[PDB]
Structures are given as C-alpha cells and as structure tokens.
Amino acid sequence: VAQGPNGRALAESMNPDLLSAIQQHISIERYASVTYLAMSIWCAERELAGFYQFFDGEAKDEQSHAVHFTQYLIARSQSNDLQTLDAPRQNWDSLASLMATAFQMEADTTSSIQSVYALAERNSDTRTTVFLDPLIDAQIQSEDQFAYLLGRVKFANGDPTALLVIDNELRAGQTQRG
Amino acid sequence: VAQGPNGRALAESMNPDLLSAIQQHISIERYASVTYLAMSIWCAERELAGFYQFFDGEAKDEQSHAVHFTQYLIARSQSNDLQTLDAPRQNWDSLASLMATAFQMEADTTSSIQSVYALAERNSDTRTTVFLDPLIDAQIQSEDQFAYLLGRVKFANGDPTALLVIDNELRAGQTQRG
Amino acid sequence: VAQGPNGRALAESMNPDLLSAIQQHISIERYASVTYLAMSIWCAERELAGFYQFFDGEAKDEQSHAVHFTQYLIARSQSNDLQTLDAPRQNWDSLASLMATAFQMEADTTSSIQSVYALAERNSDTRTTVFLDPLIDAQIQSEDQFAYLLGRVKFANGDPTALLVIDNELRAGQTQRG
Amino acid sequence: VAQGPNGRALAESMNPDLLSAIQQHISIERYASVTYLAMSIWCAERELAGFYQFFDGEAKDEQSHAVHFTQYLIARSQSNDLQTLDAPRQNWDSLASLMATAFQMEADTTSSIQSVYALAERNSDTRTTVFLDPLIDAQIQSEDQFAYLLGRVKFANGDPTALLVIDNELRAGQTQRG
Ligand SMILES: [Cl-]
Ligand SMILES: [Cl-]
Ligand SMILES: [Cl-]
Ligand SMILES: [Cl-]
Ligand SMILES: [Cl-]
Ligand SMILES: [Cl-]
Ligand SMILES: [Cl-]
Ligand SMILES: [Cl-]
Ligand SMILES: [Cl-]
Ligand SMILES: [Cl-]
Ligand SMILES: [Cl-]
Ligand SMILES: [Cl-]
Ligand code: NA
C-alpha cells in the first residue's frame, strides 16, 4: 500500500495540476467568504439589517464549503496548502452595486469549480467529478438565489421604501423565489 | 341496457353538439392552465415570487378542473377527445397587462361554461346543468378574486414598492378580499 | 454583470442549440403527461380503476417534471418557450397494447434527456449535466417500473381475472417490484 | 296566512300535477329499495356475500332517499300519499343480468326525477328544481358507480374466479372507480 503526499494510505494518485487547481479553489471559496463578510458589514453600516444577516450567514456557509474541499484533499491523501488571503472589496456606492458584485462572486465560484471539473475530466479523475457534482448543483441554486436578490433590488430602482421592504424580507428568511 | 359511445352502460344519450361543446370546454380549461403556467414563468423571470407561486397553483388547479370534466364524460358514457393545445401567450409589457389577460382568461372560461350550459338547457340535459352549477359558482369566486388582484395591481400604478408589497401578500396566501 | 435572454442576471451563457433542445424536452414531458391522462381515461372507460388511478398520478408527476425544467431555464436566465402540444394517442385494442405504448413513452422521455445530455457535454455545460443526472436516475427507476407493469400485464395473457388482480394491486399502490 | 293541503301554513301553492308526480316518484324510490333488497337476497343465495352487503346498503339508502322526498312534501305543506308497492323482480339467470337490471333501475330513478324537474320548470316551481338539483347530482354518481360494477362483472365474462375477486372487492367497500 502506497503513501500519499499527506502521509495517508493512497487509493489513487492525483495529477499535480489537478491538486494545485483544488488548492486554488479553496482560496477562491475562502475569498468569497471574506467578501460576504465585507458585504455584511457594509449593509450593517447602513442599517440594512436583513441584508447584514443574510451576508453574515453566506460568509459562514462559504467557509464551510471551503472546509469541505480541505476534507476531500485529506480523503484523497493529498496535501492541503492554505494560502494567503487577499483583502476583500469593501466599498460600494449603492446596494444595487453591492448585489452585482455578490452575484459575480457566486458565478466566479462556479467558474472555478467548472475549471477544476474540466481538469479532472482530462485526467479521468472520476472521484473528483463525482465529488464536485453536488457542489455544482448547489451553485445553480445559489446563482438562482443571487439573481433573485439582485433583480429584486434593481426593481426597487433605489427607492428606500422598497429597499426597506426587501430588507425585512431577508430578515424573515425570505431569500429565494420559493 | 344500451352501450354509450365510450363502451360503458348508457344511462341517457347525449346530443352530439353538446358532447362537442364539452370536449371543446376541456380544451379551454387546459389552455387556461398552460396560460397560467406561462404567467407564472413571466413573474418568476422578474423576481415576482408571490405572483409566480400564485399562478403556479392556478395552473395546477385549472388542470384539475379540466380533468373533472373528463370524468363527467366518463360518467355519461361519452367519448373523450383530448385535442391539440395551442401555445399560450408568453409576453407582456407590465404586470398590470398580465393581470388583465389573466382576468380575461377567467371570464372567458366562464363564458365557455355558460355556452355549454345553454346548449344543455336547449337539449333538456338536466344532468349537465346540475354538473355545471357548482363550477359556475366557483367561477364567480374566481372572477371576484382576479378582479381583486387586477384592481390592486392597477392601484399600485406601476410603483415597484407597491408591487413588492402585493407580491409578498400573494406569497403569504393573501389572494382574496376575505 | 450581463443580462441573460430572459432578463435576469446571467451566470454563464448557454448555447442556443442546447437551449432549443431543453425547450423541446419540456414539450416531450408535457406530451408524456397528456398521454398518461389519455391512458387514465382509457382505463377508466373499461372499469380498470387501479390503472386509471396510476396513470392519473403519472400524468400529474410528468407535468411536475416538465415544470422542473422550466425552473432550470429560469435559473439559467434563459427564455422559456411553451410550445403547441400535439393531441395524444387515445385508442388501444388491449391493456397490453396500452402498457407497451406507456413503456415506449417512458423510454422515449429518457432518450430525449440523453440527447440533451450529449449536447450539454459537447458544449461543456456542466451545470446542465449535473441538473440532468438525478432526472436520468429517476428515469431508470421509471423504466424499471413500467417494464414491471407491462411484464405483469403480458403475463396475464389477456385473462380478465388476472387483469382484475393486477388492477387491485395498482389501486393499493403496489406499482413496483419493491 | 293560508293553509296547505296537509294543514300546515302554506308558503306557496303547488300545482296538483306536480304534486302527483312527486308522490309517484316516492313510489319509484320505494320500489327501487325493495328491488335492491331482492337483489341482495339473490346474491346471498349464491354466496356472493360482498354483493349481498352492497345491495343491502343500497336498499337502505334508497329508502332514505324516498323519505327525503316525503319530508319535502311536508315542508311544502302538501299531502303525502304512500302508495301500494309492487312486488320486485326476484329471478335472474346470472349476476351480469342482475347488474344490468340494477343499472336500469338507477337510470329509471333519474328519469323519474327528470320528469318531475321538467314539470316543476313548466310551473315555475323554483323550490322544487332547487330541491332536486343535489339529488340529480347524486344520481350521476350512482349511475357512474353502477356502470362501473356492471362493467367489471361483464369483464369477468362469467368466470367464477373473477366474480369471487369482485365479490371480495365489494365486501371491502371498493365499490367505485375512486
Ligand atoms: Cl460601486
Ligand atoms: Cl440600490
Ligand atoms: Cl468587484
Ligand atoms: Cl402587453
Ligand atoms: Cl404594473
Ligand atoms: Cl391576450
Ligand atoms: Cl392497439
Ligand atoms: Cl391485455
Ligand atoms: Cl404509439
Ligand atoms: Cl335473466
Ligand atoms: Cl355473470
Ligand atoms: Cl327488469
Ligand atoms: Na385476490
């Protein structure tokens, strides 16, 4: 029985380019997490309490997704390499601009997963594509949700009354089309 | 004991013009159903989640009404003839325009029932007028409900804030005067 | 942030040939639904109450599958296009012939999903293959179920006693090998 | 305040031809009741216990329908006139022949109600047509049920095994398409 790079028994070797891509994706999810924290703070500073609570939860959930990936590398007997984390964006001129960045961040997270997926396919790493399948499904739902929140905020057209109504929706947990 | 056109024992023959009118009405209700599905999609595309949920339920209910009619033809030992279904209207410039089409669709459904009713009276088919009586009563309530939703949306006068408030009413199930 | 063809924020553009294939598949599932409705009526006309109840439920379930696809197009910011629905087949000389058509309809539904799947793979649309994976799994179970019902009816070899026994099985909800 | 023919206060006089038609209809329902009793006995004599239980209940229900009509005449301050009751048919060569007579009896009961209904319409007696409306609706369901039982028995094609299976269905209360 062979030993993998992290010292555990190795079921199947992993291509180093694929390993590097997964470690980079962990950084992307950690960066999404701190970005959602920054967004939660921006909303709290403007008394948008429902948006603050929503993004606080998204920050925690994105970190969990990142840790889920570190557990996969452990399971594959591959080394983890936690990287320097860039500072997030922290300034927006409007809630609509913030929500556009949030949607972009979610789509970019999926794009990173897709790039890992394609590299796994090139290397015939079926464990990795199977591992990623439910995470892509969750990203479809998250993209649908962030398009809903962004579209509702854009519909408000900067009216504070409409934004207070949506803020109260989010505080109540009404965050998707349902 | 005589056999009816669908092969079952026949309690009382039905005039072929009346049979054709009932088969056409089934098509009208099936068309109302797919129209409400189209409306649910239009609302979902604009993040009007409460209207999306309302019309999704109306689509399912209208299909049930259609099947209720197919069961009556079975009970009368008459043949069913499921017809080609036209594609629904799918484009509107405003929610107010959509709700006007929805109200028109409900009134047109009643008008079709009324035309069947009058033909049953001409043929002295008391089973059919009795069968239709509670369906007309339900249509009165549905017309009252759709006039309420259309009138509330028109009262909003295109203000997004007002439309978000009404959208949340519908998501909560507040869909009638009560 | 770009806008998709249905107006919502766009996470990733979709190839128009793939979009057309998904819209066509929605029509296939809607056609399966009305076909199962036609089958439910045919069975009801012959007092096969368990088969009537089974196909009535299959009609409702197939419509739900169709709506599930419309929701995916919404989530991908793609336009829906609800199409004209052909009239279903409505006449069979025997229950065994009906069940053969039902099995064929289920296999043809899977074949349509497979064709969408292959087109998604050609375009590297991993969101769509992930979305389709559980629907293919459900189709495997449905094909297994319809092969069971068709095989049991063929085993009956046209004996009315055997068909009454199977009819009572279906009324009781005994519709699979288990 | 005027007194009606039975001595009670009279809300609205009733045409004597209509009164005679209602008294005759009470006899028809009483005759249906004793006919169903005769059928229950015929089935019991042949150990068709489920059919015996079904027709025993139909006999009791038909008598209740008859009494319902006597209560309407009381409510309209009209005289009741309970008539001589003919002896029922009591001999059949097969269960299929019995079920045909049962279906005919149900259709003939509806026909009698229809004749009362038309006479009420000619006399503009809206109380009577309103009273009859739910009874016609129940007759539609009863005709549907008796067509189901007759059709299932005919499907059996005289096979004792099939008739025992249907007999057990009826004993269990499985008496309609559902
Ligand atoms: Cl900005
Ligand atoms: Cl804004
Ligand atoms: Cl940015
Ligand atoms: Cl318009
Ligand atoms: Cl509007
Ligand atoms: Cl229109
Ligand atoms: Cl055939
Ligand atoms: Cl067969
Ligand atoms: Cl076919
Ligand atoms: Cl006889
Ligand atoms: Cl027989
Ligand atoms: Cl007779
Ligand atoms: Na049995």
Numbering used by the authors:
A (entry chain A), B (entry chain A), C (entry chain A), D (entry chain A): 5 to 182
What do the study's own words say?
Ferritins are proteins forming 24meric rhombic dodecahedral cages that play a key role in iron storage and detoxification in all cell types. Their function requires the transport of Fe2+ from the exterior of the protein to buried di-iron catalytic sites, known as ferroxidase centres, where Fe2+ is oxidized to form Fe3+-oxo precursors of the ferritin mineral core. SynFtn, isolated from the cyanobacterium Synechococcus CC9311, is an atypical prokaryotic ferritin that was recently shown to take up Fe2+ via its threefold channels. The wild-type protein contains three iron binding sites: high- and low-affinity binding sites at the FOC, sites 1 and 2, respectively, and site 3 located in the threefold channel and coordinated by the side chains of three symmetry equivalent Asp137 residues.
To probe the possibility that Glu141 of SynFtn acts as a ‘transfer’ carboxylate with equivalent function to the conserved carboxylates of the animal ferritins, two variants, E141A and E141D, were generated. Variants E141A and E141D both crystallized under conditions identical to those reported for wild-type SynFtn. Protein structures derived from all crystals harvested without iron enrichment were free of bound metal ions, as expected. The structures of variants E141A and E141D overlay with that reported for the wild-type protein with overall rmsd (for main chain atoms) of 0.10 and 0.11 Å, respectively, with the major difference in structure being associated with the side chain of the substituted residue. Typically when site 3 is vacant, residue 141 is oriented toward the FOC. This is the case for the metal-free structure of variant E141D, while conformational flexibility at this position is not possible in E141A. In contrast, the rate constant for iron binding to the E141D variant was almost identical to the wild-type protein, at 3.4×105  m −1 s−1, demonstrating that the conservative replacement of Glu by Asp did not have a significant effect on oxidation rate. Consistent with this, variant E141D was able to bind, oxidize and mineralize iron all at similar rates to the wild-type protein, despite the lack of any crystallographic evidence for conformational flexibility of Asp141. It appears, therefore, that the charge of the carboxylate group is of greater importance for SynFtn function than the observed conformational flexibility of residue Glu141, despite the altered fractional occupancy of SynFtn iron binding sites induced by the E141D substitution.
